[PDB]
CSV table of C-alpha atoms and ligand atoms in Angstrom, one decimal:
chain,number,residue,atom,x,y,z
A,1,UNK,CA,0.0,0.0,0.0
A,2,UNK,CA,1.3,3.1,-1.7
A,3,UNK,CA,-1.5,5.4,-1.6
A,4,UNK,CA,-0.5,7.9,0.7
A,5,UNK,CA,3.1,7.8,-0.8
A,6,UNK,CA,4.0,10.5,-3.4
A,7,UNK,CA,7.7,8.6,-5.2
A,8,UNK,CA,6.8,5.0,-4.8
A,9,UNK,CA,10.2,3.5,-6.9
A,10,UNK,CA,13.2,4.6,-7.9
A,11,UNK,CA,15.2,3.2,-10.2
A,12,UNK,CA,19.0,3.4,-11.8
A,13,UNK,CA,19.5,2.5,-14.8
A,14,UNK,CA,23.6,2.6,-15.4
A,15,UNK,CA,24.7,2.5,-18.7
A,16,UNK,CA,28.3,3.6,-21.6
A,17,UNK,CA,26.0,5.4,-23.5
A,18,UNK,CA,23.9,6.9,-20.8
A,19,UNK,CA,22.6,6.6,-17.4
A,20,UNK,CA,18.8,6.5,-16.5
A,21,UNK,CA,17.5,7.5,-13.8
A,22,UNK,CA,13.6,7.4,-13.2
A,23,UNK,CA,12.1,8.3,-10.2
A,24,UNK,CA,8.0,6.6,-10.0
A,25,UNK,CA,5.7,8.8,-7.9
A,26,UNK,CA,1.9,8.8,-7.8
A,27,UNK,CA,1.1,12.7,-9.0
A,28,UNK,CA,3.3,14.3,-11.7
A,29,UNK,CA,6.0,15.8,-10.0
A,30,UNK,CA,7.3,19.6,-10.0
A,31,UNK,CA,11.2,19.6,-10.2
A,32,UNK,CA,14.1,21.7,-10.7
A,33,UNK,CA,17.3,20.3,-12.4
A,34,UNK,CA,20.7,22.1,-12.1
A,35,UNK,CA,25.0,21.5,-11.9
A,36,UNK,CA,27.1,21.9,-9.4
A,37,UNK,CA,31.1,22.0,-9.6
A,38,UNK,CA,34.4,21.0,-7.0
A,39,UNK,CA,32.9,18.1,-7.6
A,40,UNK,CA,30.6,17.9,-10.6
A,41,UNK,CA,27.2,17.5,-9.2
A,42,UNK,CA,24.1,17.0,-10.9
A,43,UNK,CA,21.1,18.1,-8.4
A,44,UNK,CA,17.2,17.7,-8.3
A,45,UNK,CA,14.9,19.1,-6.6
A,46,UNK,CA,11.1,17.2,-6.0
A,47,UNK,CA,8.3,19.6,-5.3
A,48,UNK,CA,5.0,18.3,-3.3
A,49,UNK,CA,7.4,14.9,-2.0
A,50,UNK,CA,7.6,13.8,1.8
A,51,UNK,CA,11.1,12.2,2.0
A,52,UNK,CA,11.0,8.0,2.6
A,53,UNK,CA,12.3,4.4,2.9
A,54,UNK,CA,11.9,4.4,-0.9
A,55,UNK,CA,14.4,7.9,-1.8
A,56,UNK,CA,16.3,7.0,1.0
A,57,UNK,CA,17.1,3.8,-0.8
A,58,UNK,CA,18.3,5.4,-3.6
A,59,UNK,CA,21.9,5.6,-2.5
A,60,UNK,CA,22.3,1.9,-2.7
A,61,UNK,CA,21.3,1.4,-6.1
A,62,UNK,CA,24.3,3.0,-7.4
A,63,UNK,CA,26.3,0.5,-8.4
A,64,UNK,CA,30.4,0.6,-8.5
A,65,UNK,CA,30.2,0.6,-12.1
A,66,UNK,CA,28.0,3.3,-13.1
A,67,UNK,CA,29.9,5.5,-15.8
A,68,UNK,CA,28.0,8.2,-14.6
A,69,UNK,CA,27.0,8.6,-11.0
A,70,UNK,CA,29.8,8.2,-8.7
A,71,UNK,CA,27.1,8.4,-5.7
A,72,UNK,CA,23.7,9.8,-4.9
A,73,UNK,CA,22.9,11.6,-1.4
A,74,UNK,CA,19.0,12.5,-1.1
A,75,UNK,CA,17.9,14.6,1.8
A,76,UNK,CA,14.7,16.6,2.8
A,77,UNK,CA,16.0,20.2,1.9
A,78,UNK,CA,12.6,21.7,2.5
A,79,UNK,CA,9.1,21.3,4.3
A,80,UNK,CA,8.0,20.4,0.8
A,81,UNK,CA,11.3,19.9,-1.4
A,82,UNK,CA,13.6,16.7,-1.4
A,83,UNK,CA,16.8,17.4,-3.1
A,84,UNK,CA,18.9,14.5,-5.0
A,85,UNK,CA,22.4,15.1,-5.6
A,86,UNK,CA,24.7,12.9,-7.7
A,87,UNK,CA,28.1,13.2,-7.6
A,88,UNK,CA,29.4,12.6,-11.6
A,89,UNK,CA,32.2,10.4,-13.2
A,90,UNK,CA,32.0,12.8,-16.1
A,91,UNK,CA,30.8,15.4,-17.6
A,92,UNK,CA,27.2,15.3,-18.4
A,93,UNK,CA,24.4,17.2,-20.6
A,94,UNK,CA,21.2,15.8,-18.5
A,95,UNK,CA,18.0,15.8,-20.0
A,96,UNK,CA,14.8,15.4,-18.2
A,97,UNK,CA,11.2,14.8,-19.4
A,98,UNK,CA,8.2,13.3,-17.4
A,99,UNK,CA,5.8,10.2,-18.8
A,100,UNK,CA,2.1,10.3,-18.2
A,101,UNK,CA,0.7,7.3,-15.8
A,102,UNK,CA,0.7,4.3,-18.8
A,103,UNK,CA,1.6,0.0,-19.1
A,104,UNK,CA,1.0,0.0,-15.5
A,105,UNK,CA,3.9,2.6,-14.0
A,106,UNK,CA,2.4,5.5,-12.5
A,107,UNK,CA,4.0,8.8,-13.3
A,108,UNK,CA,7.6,8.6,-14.3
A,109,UNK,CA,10.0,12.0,-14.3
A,110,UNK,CA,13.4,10.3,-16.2
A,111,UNK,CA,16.4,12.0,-16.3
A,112,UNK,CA,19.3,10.6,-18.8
A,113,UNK,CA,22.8,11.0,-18.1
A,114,UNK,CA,24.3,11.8,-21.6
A,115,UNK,CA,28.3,12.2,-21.6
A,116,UNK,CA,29.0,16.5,-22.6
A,117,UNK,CA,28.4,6.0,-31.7
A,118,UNK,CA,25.3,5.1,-30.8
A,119,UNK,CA,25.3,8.6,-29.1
A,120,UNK,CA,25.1,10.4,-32.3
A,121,UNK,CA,21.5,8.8,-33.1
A,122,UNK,CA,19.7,9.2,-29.6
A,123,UNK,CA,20.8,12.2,-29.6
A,124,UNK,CA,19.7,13.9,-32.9
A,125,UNK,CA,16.1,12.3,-32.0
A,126,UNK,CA,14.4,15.5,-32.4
A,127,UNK,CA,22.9,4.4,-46.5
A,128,UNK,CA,21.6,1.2,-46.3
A,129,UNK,CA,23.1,-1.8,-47.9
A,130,UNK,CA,25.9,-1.1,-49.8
A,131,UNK,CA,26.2,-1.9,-53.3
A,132,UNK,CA,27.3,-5.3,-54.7
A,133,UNK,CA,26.2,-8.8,-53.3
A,134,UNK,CA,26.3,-9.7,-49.7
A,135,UNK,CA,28.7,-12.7,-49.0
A,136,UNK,CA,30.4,-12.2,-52.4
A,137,UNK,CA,31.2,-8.6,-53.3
A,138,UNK,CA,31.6,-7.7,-49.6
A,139,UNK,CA,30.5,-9.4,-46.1
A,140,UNK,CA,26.5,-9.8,-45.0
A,141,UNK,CA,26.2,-7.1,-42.5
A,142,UNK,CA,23.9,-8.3,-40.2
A,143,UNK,CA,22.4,-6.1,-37.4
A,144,UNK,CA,21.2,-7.7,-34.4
A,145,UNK,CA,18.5,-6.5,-32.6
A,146,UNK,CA,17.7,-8.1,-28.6
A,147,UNK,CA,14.5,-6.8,-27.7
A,148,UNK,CA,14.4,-4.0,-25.0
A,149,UNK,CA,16.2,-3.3,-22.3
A,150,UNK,CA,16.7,-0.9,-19.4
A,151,UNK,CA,13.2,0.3,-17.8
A,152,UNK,CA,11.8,-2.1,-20.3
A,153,UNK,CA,12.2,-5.7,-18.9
A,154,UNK,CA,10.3,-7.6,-21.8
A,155,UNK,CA,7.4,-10.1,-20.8
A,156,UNK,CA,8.4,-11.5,-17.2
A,157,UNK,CA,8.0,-15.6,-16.6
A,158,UNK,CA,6.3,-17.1,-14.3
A,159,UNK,CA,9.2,-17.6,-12.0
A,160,UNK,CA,10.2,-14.2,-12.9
A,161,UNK,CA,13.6,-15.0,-15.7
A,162,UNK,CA,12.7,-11.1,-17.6
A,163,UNK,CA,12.6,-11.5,-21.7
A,164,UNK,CA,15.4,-8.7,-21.8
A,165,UNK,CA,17.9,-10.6,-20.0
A,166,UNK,CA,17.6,-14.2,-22.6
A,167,UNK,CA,17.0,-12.3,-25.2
A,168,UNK,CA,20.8,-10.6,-24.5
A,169,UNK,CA,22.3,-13.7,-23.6
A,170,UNK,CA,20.9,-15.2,-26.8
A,171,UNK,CA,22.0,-12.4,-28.9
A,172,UNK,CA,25.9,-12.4,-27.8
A,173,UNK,CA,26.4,-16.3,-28.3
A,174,UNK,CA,25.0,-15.5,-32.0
A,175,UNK,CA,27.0,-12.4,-32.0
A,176,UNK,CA,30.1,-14.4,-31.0
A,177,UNK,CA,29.4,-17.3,-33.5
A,178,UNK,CA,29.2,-14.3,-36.6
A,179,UNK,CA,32.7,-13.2,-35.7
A,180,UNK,CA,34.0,-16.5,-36.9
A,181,UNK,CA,32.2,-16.1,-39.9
A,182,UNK,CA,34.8,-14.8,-42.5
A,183,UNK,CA,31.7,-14.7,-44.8
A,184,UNK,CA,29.6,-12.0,-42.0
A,185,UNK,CA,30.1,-8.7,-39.8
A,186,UNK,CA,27.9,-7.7,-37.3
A,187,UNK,CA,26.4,-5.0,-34.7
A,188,UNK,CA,24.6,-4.8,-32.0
A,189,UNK,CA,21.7,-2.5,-31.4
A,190,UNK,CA,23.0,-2.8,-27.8
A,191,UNK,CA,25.0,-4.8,-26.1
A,192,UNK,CA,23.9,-4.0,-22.6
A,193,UNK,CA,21.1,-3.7,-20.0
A,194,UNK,CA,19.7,0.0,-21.9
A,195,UNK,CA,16.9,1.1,-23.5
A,196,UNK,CA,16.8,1.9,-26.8
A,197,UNK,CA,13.1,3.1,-28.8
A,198,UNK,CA,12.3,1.5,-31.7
A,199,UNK,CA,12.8,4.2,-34.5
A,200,UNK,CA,16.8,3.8,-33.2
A,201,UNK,CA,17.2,0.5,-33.3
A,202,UNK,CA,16.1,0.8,-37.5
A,203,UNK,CA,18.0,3.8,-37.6
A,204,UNK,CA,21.2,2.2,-35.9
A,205,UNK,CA,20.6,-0.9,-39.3
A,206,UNK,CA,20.0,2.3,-41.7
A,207,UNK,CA,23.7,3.9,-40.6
A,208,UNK,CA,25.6,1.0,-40.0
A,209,UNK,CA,24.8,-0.3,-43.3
A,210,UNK,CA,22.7,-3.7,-42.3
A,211,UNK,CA,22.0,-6.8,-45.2
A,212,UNK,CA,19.8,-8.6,-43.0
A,213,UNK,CA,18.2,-7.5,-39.9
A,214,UNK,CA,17.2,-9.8,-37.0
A,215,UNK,CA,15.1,-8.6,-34.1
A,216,UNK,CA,14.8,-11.3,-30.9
A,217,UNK,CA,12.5,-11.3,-28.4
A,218,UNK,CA,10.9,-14.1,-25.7
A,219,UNK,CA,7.0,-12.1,-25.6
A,220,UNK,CA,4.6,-13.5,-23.6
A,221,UNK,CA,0.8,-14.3,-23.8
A,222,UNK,CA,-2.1,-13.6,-21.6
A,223,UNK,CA,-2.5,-17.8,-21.4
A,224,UNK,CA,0.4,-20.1,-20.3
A,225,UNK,CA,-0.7,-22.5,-23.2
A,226,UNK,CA,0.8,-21.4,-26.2
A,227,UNK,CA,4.7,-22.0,-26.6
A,228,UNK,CA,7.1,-22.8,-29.1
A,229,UNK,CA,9.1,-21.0,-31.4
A,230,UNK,CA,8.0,-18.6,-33.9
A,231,UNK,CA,9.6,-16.0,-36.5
A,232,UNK,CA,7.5,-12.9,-38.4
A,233,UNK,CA,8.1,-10.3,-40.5
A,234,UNK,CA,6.5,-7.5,-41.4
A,235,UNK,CA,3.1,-6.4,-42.8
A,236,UNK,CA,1.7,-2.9,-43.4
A,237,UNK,CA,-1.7,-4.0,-44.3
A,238,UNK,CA,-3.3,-6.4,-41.8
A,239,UNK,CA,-1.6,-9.2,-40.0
A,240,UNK,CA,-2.1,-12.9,-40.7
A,241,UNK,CA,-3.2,-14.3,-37.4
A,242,UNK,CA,-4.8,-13.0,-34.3
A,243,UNK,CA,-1.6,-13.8,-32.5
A,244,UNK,CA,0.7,-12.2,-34.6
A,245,UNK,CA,-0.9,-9.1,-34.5
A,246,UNK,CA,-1.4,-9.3,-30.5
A,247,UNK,CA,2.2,-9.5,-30.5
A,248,UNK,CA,2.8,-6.6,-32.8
A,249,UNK,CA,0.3,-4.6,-30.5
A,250,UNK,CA,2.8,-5.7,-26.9
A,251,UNK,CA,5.9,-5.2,-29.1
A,252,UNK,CA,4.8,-1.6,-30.3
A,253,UNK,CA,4.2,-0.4,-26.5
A,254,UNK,CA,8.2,-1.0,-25.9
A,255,UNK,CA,8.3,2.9,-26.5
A,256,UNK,CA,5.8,3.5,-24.0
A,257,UNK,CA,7.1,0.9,-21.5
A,258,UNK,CA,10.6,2.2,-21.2
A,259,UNK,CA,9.9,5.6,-22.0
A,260,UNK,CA,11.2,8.1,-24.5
A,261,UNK,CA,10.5,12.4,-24.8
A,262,UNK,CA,6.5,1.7,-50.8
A,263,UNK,CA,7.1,0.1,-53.8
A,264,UNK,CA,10.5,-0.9,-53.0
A,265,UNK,CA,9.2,-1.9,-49.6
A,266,UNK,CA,7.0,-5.1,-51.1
A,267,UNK,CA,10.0,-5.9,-52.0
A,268,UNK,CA,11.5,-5.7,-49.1
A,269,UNK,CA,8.8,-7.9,-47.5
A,270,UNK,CA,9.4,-11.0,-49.7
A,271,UNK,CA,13.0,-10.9,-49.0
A,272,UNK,CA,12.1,-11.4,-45.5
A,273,UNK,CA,9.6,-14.0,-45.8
A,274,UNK,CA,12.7,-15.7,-47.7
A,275,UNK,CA,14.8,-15.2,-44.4
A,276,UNK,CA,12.0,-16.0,-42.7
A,277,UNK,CA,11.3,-19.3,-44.0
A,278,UNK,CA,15.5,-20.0,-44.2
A,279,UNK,CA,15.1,-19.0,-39.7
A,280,UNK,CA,12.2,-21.2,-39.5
A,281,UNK,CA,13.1,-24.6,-41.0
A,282,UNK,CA,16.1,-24.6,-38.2
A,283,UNK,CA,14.3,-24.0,-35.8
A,284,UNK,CA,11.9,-26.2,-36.3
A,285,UNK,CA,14.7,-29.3,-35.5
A,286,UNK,CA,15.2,-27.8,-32.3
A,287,UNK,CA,12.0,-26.5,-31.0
A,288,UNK,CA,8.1,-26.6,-31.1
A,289,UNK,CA,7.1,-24.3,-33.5
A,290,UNK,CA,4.8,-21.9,-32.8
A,291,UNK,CA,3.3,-21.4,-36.0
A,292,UNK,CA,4.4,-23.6,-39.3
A,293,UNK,CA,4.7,-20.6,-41.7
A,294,UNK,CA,6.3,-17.2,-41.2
A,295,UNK,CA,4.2,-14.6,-40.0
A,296,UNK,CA,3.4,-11.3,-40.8
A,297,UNK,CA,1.9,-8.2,-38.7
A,298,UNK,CA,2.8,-4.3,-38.1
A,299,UNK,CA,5.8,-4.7,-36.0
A,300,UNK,CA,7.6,-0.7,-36.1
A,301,UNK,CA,10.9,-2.6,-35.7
A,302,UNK,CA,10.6,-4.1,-38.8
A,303,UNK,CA,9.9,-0.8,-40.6
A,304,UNK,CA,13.3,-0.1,-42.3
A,305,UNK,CA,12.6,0.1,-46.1
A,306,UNK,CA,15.9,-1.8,-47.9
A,307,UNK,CA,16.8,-3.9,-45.2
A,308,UNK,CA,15.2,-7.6,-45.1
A,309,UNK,CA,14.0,-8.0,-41.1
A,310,UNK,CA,12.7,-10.4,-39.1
A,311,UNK,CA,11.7,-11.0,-35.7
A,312,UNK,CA,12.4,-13.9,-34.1
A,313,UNK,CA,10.2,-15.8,-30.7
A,314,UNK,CA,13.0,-17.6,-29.4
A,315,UNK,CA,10.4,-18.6,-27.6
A,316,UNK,CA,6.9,-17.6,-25.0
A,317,UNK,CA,8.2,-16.9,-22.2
A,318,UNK,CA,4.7,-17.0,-20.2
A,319,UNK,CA,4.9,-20.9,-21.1
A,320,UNK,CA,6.4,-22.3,-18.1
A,321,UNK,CA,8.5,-24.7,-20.0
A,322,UNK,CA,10.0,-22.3,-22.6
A,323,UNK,CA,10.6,-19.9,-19.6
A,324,UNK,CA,13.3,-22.7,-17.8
A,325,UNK,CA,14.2,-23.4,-21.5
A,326,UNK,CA,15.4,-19.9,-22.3
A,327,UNK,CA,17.9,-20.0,-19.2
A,328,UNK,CA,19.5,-22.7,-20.3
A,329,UNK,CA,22.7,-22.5,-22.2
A,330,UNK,CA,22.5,-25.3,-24.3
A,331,UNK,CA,18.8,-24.1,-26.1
A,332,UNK,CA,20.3,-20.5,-26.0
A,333,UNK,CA,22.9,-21.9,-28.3
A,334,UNK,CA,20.8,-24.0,-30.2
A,335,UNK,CA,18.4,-21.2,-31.1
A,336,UNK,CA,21.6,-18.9,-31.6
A,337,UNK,CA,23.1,-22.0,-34.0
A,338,UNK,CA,19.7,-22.0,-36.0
A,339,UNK,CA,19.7,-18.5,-37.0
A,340,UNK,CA,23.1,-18.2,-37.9
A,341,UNK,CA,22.3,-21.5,-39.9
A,342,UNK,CA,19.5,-20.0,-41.1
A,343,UNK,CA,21.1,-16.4,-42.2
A,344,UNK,CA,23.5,-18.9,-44.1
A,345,UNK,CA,21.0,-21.3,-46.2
A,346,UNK,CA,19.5,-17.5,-47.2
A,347,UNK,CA,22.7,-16.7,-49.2
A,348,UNK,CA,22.7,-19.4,-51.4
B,1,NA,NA1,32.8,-12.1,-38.9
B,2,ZN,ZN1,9.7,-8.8,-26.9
């Protein structure tokens, strides 16, 4: 019970490119964000807040490794003022913006960290393939893409394993397995517990010059039921089953959940139902398959308009069986094997 509360979480997120810091209170909150020097100081002051077990907690979820915050000291500074002070590991440019109660969080004032690659797209938030033929010409660039991050944990299991922690584990052992690829090169949209919206991850495949983009992701249903694997891509005009475009629907909200402030594309389409298809098959000798065929709904990660993309269901992590699955190594390999196998039965 958190009713008479006004912050009711607090929450760091640490991380190279920025740290996050969101601070979850019951009305929106009045603040006032300035620096301080000898040392560097970023402070912020809460308007209408009671200090609490919560803020006073604060101070311990620093951790040794933040680039950013070297420490945080919170103290009532006021009848009606609580002041936060973070000592800095460098110099910042902070930027603050406040979220509207949605996705179950109440109101949400974030502040990001940014230092004074990946930096250069978040923040001008305000190409393509290259020529000749991919594997022959020049290495597949492939761009992969683990599904959310930060403030946005993914679908949670059952016994609580969070779809943005797999879904990382699963991308670096596929990462790891391209760089022995002479054949392949590939990038990360991150490569860390951070949030990134959706329109950067495309972005991020736009500038780095992707052939194939691969998005992965361990969603979640209502009902425990349903598991197995699955792999879509995407569709601008209606999607082919009620689940796929339920999960286009959860997927889309990422933006939301972690909180931010045409004819060639056809084309583009049927080279990903060819990827697909090539993702599929090998997945199918390793796991249930959700779904037979590839499918197809409006998934805004899947948007870029040269790049073949895909999004790959490892696997449903609200089924209680896929959940222990997905912390395994051994099916986190298999599944990372089976797109790499996949990627390579595509060129050829
Ligand atoms: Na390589
Ligand atoms: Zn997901």
């Amino acid at each position: 019970f958190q009713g008479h509360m006004q912050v009711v979480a607090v929450r760091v997120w640490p991380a190279s490119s920025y740290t996050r810091v969101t601070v979850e209170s019951n009305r929106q909150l009045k603040y006032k964000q300035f620096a301080l020097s000898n040392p560097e100081r970023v402070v912020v002051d809460i308007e209408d807040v009671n200090l609490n077990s919560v803020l006073k907690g604060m101070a311990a979820q620093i951790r040794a490794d933040d680039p950013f915050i070297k420490s945080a000291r919170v103290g009532q500074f006021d009848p009606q003022t609580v002041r936060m002070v973070f000592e800095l590991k460098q110099n910042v440019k902070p930027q603050l913006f406040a979220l509207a109660p949605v996705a179950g969080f109440k109101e949400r004032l974030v502040m990001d960290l940014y230092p004074a690659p990946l930096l250069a797209l978040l923040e001008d938030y305000n190409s393509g393939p290259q020529p000749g033929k991919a594997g022959r010409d020049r290495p597949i660039v492939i761009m992969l893409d683990p599904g959310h991050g930060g403030e946005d944990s993914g679908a949670v299991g059952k016994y609580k394993t969070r779809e943005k922690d797999v879904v990382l584990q699963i991308a670096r052992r596929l990462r790891s397995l391209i760089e022995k690829e002479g054949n392949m090169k590939v990038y990360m949209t991150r490569n860390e517990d951070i949030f990134i919206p959706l329109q950067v991850r495309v972005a991020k495949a736009q500038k780095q010059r992707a052939d194939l983009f691969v998005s992965i992701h361990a969603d979640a249903f209502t009902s425990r039921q349903p598991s197995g694997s699955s792999v879509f891509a995407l569709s601008t005009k209606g999607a082919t089953s009620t689940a796929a475009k339920y999960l286009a629907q959860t997927q889309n909200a990422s933006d939301l959940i972690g909180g931010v402030s045409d004819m060639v594309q056809s084309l583009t389409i049927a080279d990903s139902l060819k990827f697909g298809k090539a993702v599929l098959n090998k997945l199918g000798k390793i796991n249930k398959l959700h779904k037979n065929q590839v499918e197809q709904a409006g998934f805004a990660v899947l948007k870029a308009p040269d790049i073949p993309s895909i999004l790959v269901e490892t696997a449903f992590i609200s089924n209680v069986e896929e959940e222990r699955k997905l912390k395994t190594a051994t099916f986190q390999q298999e599944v990372a094997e089976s797109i790499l196998a996949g990627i390579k039965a595509y060129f050829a």
